[PDB]
Amino acid sequence: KPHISALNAPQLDQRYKNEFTIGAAVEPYQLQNEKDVQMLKRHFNSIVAENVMKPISIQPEEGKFNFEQADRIVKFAKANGMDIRFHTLVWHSQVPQWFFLDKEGKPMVNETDPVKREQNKQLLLKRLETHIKTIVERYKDDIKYWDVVNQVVGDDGKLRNSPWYQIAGIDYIKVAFQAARKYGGDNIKLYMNDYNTEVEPKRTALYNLVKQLKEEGVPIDGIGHQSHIQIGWPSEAEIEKTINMFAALGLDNQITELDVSMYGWPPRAYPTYDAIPKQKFLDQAARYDRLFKLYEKLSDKISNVTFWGIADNHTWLDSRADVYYDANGNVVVDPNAPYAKVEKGKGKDAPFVFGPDYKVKPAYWAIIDHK
């Protein structure tokens, strides 16, 4: 099956249009790249901002809201009939430092006095409510799907002990959802998003958290499974079990940030795209085959599958593509083998179904067919 230009390959979204939307994460510069634009128009019917809707991009100083970049994505989506997801109202990263300062400018996490700690909690929660309000009041009629909180459960299966949690305890999560619902109404859909959702003890900790929140009347419509995965991990069976366990709580499931890295963890990357052996693309294609068969099997539980980029020329996974060199300067990709140095974030991953030259990969063929 040939490596043809994607720009006129059969449309991915159309393949899946009765099963779930097909989405891409974008940067605003990509809406000014002719190829990226034609890719979005051709293959995708949902869109999300990779970065420009995060807390630090939207409100970098208190009272200073930049919606200009966010607005461009929204405008594009509307003109092209795409669904929109908002990523994300609350996170422990890419979040402005000002939220967590007390009235004297000291970090709130330092405060020892209990009455002052409680005052800081209430102040933080007010600021959270104001951030959410201002965003949802602007976008509630345009944006259907909302990542209300991102990564709030730890890999150890405890709540992530971020400043949100250290300052305000569990109530930051409830307040975020209640605020979104209050200002956005009943027709926006609210998600908790996280990675390694298939993995214990994180998975059951997420499940117990959400079950309790819903029992307490916190409005949560779904779970976002970030799905930053590898060729051989996590298994499809464990993916299935995960999706099924949340759908049994009455939750929608979205595959929100899918990419299938060529590498393991921590990754030992190739230094360039050209160095990645052909067999890796085949192994990837077979993984994508199995994965999409599974998502189809579960399509009544999955409303969207979004890729965390458009094509292999641009992926956040390059920032993790560490390149290991042996004493003779040769590249090392065997996870156990000797090496002398590492160049962090200097290599190349290849996670999508579309190549860096915008031509279709074997993974594309594997998911566009009906086998």
Ligand X SMILES: O[C@@H]1[C@@H](O)[C@H](O[C@@H]2CO[C@@H](O[C@@H]3CO[C@@H](O[C@@H]4CO[C@@H](O[C@@H]5CO[C@@H](O[C@@H]6CO[C@@H](O)[C@H](O)[C@H]6O)[C@H](O)[C@H]5O)[C@H](O)[C@H]4O)[C@H](O)[C@H]3O)[C@H](O)[C@H]2O)OC[C@H]1O
- Determine the 3-state secondary structure of 189 from DSSP: strand
CB of 240 to ligand X, least distance (A): 18
Pick 138 or 293: Cβ nearer Zn ion = 293
Interface with ligand X (CB under 6 A), residue total: 11
Query: Does 316 help bind Cl ion (rule: CB under 5 A)?
Result: yes
Q: Which does 196 bind (CB under 5 to 8 A by kind): Cl ion, ligand X, Zn ion, none?
A: ligand X
List all residues 6 or more positions away from 301 whose beta carbon is below 8 Å from its beta carbon: 243, 244, 247, 252, 253
Q: Any contact of residue 339 with Cl ion (CB under 5 A)?
A: no
Q: Binding residue for Zn ion (CB under 5 A) from 355, 358, 361, 363?
A: 355
Among the listed residues 281, 316, 325, 339, the single contact to ligand X using CB under 6 A: 316
Beta pairing, strands 323-325 & 331-332: antiparallel
Q: Is 203 in the site for ligand X (CB under 6 A)?
A: no
Site for ligand X, residues 104 to 163, rule: CB under 6 A: 150
Compute CA 145 distance to the chain's CA centroid, rounded to the nearest angstrom.
13
Smallest distance, Å, CB 308 to Cl ion? 8
Secondary structure (H, E, C), 2-33: CCCEHHHCCCHHHHCCCCCEEEEEECHHHHHC
Q: Which is nearer to Zn ion, 278 or 328 (CB)?
A: 278
Q: Which of 133, 299, 342, 365 binds Zn ion (CB under 5 A)?
A: 299
Q: Report the alpha-carbon distance of residue 366 to residue 295 in Å, rounded.
A: 14
Report the alpha-carbon distance of residue 306 to residue 309 in Å, rounded: 9
Establish if 287 lies at the interface with ligand X (CB under 6 A).
Answer: no
CB of 233 to ligand X, least distance (A): 6
8 in contact with Zn ion (CB under 5 A): no
217: Cβ contacts below 8 Å, ≥ 6 apart: none
C-alpha triplet 61, 64, 69: angle, nearest 5°: 105
| Positions that interact with Cl ion (CB under 5 A) | 316, 355, 357
